């Protein structure tokens, strides 16, 4: 047996299987695409539960003539969608609302229980008439299961995505991504629990802005190894 090829094989497998390890992160990238094709990406990671929580103000395209707009200004625009005649806008804000959201998940994910909840502009459960009395988490619809779309992970057998088209109204996002424990062991049971609790919510988030999707593909997706799908069903 050729040991140079054996070494290559071991190297490949070490990279492919690493996400299955204890304390190895699951990965979440959310991409918002806007009408002129610009993109905003949000990255979250954790080994046990990813909690991808995005305010409606964070999901707006927030660049105006080269400067970043404030939460105050953005929330002012969002308000008129949440409550009738609560701001002074004479036209809509659709230029800054995403057309499409893409959710890229990679790693040792419990695909039965991963939930993606698209919520209202002030964070309440989405419905025709949002109200505090009827506000909850993890609605039945949020569990996508076999509605996830499989994508190449280049040997990892571990990337899927979900896509949604928005309808011209601001939204907020709550994504909960639990670790696969279908090997029959409860990591929250016994003395290990404290070690798991210590690891929750310990990875820095990262938000990036791109003027077009090819910049996203070139400087995020292919830089780090998250495969993305474009509007022509071609992978990058």
């Amino acid at each position: 047996a050729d040991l140079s090829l054996a070494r290559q094989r071991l190297t490949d497998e070490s990279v492919n299987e690493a996400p299955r390890a204890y304390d190895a992160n699951m990965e979440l990238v959310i991409v918002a695409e806007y009408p002129e094709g610009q993109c905003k990406s949000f990255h979250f990671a954790n080994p046990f539960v990813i909690k991808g929580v995005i305010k409606s103000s964070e999901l707006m395209w927030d660049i105006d003539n080269g400067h970043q707009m404030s939460e105050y200004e953005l929330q002012r625009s969002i308000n008129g969608y949440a409550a009738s005649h609560s701001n002074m806008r004479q036209r809509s804000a659709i230029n800054r609302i995403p057309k499409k959201l893409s959710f890229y998940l990679r790693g040792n994910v419990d695909w039965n229980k991963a939930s993606i909840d698209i919520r209202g502009p002030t964070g309440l459960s989405m419905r025709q008439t949002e109200e505090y009395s009827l506000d909850r988490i993890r609605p039945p619809c949020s569990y996508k299961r076999n509605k996830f779309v499989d994508l190449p992970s280049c040997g990892g057998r571990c990337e899927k995505a979900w896509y949604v088209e928005l309808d011209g109204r601001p939204v907020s996002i709550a994504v909960i991504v639990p670790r696969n424990m279908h090997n029959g062991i409860n990591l929250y049971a016994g003395p290990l629990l404290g070690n798991v609790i210590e690891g929750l919510d310990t990875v820095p988030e990262c938000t990036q802005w791109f003027d077009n999707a090819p910049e996203l593909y070139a400087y995020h997706a292919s830089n780090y190894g998250m495969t993305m799908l474009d509007q022509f069903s071609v992978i990058h």
Copy 2:
């Protein structure tokens, strides 16, 4: 029996009782009111533990001639209250410090254990002489219990509030709101624990700015069904 009225009754009860469900959110709205009557509201929600954590810089009225001030500028002003002669201010910043804070809680709350802790300008336990050695959470005074004021929830039997007048010094806030488990069942016990842990800290926050209290009543309180009390003891 009139079935149109029976249907109305069932509908009423479905709305009134929904917050008692597993995975139904408890709701927290904090309102800061400033000397010229403007208001800032902060909304938090969770089914298991609400953690309402606000920095002193976030609690300042932060609008200056139509633009939002930066954390850098706000913290600079706060500093002179925390440490003598640590900024260059020749006058106080009382114009931007809240006069009053109102805490509105709605849902299946453990009223015995809900805690509201008003902390110092850099997040330490409040005392005459703040110091790292004497910094802790959940002081005895923070549990309000029967000092909560009952307010109408329009059939829910589940809203209370707490009020405090400030004394011209910046503060920070830590509110911990645990779920009522007085039905005798520990949701943290057994296999359910992981499901509870997954649900913690998964709801987007929302901050709003209003120029006067009637805007708050019209476009937040009555829009979503949180009853608020004004300075004339009239509900909205």
Copy 3:
């Protein structure tokens, strides 16, 4: 026995031992020092697990002619370090990257398990070639143990520090600081667990900017009782 001295002694001990109490905070101050000597400090606290999580954009010196720069502008500069030719910079950004980081820990810390992880510019595990497949938390190197440096805590016997020199590239930070439970009792075991979970992540953070280290010593360190060490090995 002189009871005025006995009272002094009891007072001293009450202050010295307070951090050992249940619900007493452990304290973390991170100080970034930049080439012109300016400093940024970040304070975190919790009684059970401190989670000090800082994005690469937050660690840049972010003041430009008296105004605070936006995350958009800062992330743009960081991008060129993460992905080749992903921004339009013709020179580096070393003026705004810390030269040195200092980590000050005070309280009832588990020194065996405290971990300080210096991560890449977009939050991934640091390595020559950062990639999503090889991203994890709590690497073996992050546990400093006896590589912590002991510093005076003025009777508390409970402050240590860690120092690192950076190499001109932006980084992100994840610090996990667990409570000392070497007295043989597991606080996550039994009915106490819910009370611990309720206390996680409930203390407001505080970020401060200083133009030079003596301002930091005078208006933070000596104001609150965190001892710091300067470049001459002198304490403040």
